[PDB]
Design a protein around this ligand. Structure first.
Ligand code: NAG
Ligand code: CA
Ligand code: CA
Ligand code: CA
Length: 258
């Protein structure tokens, strides 16, 4: 999840001319072109065609000026095209200028200039400056790709939101990697580091620094086994044993054999 930004900085149509060779509204007069800009974003093309759908998204500006201008809480000279898919890095950018004419009709003949640029851009880079010269107009503009908050990587598809609750305990680093908080481990940082010395063959923990023993083991580090209940002069090696000392017998090692 991310967005593509284009910042228009300059545009010149000295003659007040459209691409078809007519005046917008001796020179071309004084009723100037009422200029606005469209941005088409589509797949990368070896040969860039004017036709084709904007399969990556599109945008437009309001009318910004007459024949020539620079720019300069909503910026009219900035086109933002959000996207959900993974950013493919390579792309075709088509930028068109238009005269608006106060007519509910879609008159295509009102096109001023069309420029294009096939290339590669990553979110890591910042504003790339692009200069264009057509038969009519000269454009100057910057472009940028940014990931939304908690999205990372060159595709803007790697997700990481910090979390400290029922499902995990971690922050995020520069590149979207989970950094487990003090006392947690595992790929999703939901697995706790038990206190040190805890034999984890027979121990476990829900909370960092804890170690409770499996059935049949005991002790602080859960490294000591549980003798058969009632065992007197006997000891344990594996749980539930009662191995007698010398001259002692019985199930509980309580019978004097001397
Ligand atoms: C369009 O121009 C103005 C708005 O800019 C409007 O008042 C006028 O009626 C319109 N003219 C037409 C449709 O010829
Ligand atoms: Ca016109
Ligand atoms: Ca005009
Ligand atoms: Ca016009």
């Amino acid at each position: 999840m991310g967005y593509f930004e284009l910042q228009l900085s300059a545009l010149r149509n000295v003659n007040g001319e459209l691409l078809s060779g007519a005046c917008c509204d001796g020179g071309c007069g004084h009723d100037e072109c009422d200029t606005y800009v469209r941005v088409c974003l589509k797949e990368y093309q070896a040969k860039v065609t004017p036709t084709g759908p904007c399969s990556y998204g599109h945008g437009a500006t309001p009318v910004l000026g007459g024949n020539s201008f620079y720019l300069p809480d909503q910026d009219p000279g900035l086109v933002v095209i959000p996207f959900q898919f993974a950013w493919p890095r390579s792309f075709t950018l088509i930028v068109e200028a238009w005269d608006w004419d106060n007519d509910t009709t879609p008159n295509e003949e009102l096109l001023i200039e069309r420029v294009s640029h096939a290339g590669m851009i990553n979110p890591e880079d910042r504003w790339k400056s692009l200069h264009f010269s057509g038969h009519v107009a000269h454009l100057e503009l910057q472009i940028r790709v940014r990931c939304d908050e908690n999205y990372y990587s060159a595709t803007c598809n790697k997700f990481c939101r910090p979390r400290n609750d029922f499902f995990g305990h971690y922050t995020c680093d520069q590149y979207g990697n989970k950094a487990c908080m003090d006392g947690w481990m595992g790929k999703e940082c939901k697995e706790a580091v038990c206190k040190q010395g805890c034999n984890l063959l027979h121990g476990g923990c829900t909370v960092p620094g804890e170690c409770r023993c499996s059935y049949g083991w005991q002790g602080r580090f859960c490294d000591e086994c549980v003798p058969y209940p009632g065992c007197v002069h006997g000891s344990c090696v594996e749980p539930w044993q009662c191995n007698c000392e010398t001259n002692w017998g019985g199930l509980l090692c309580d019978k004097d054999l001397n």
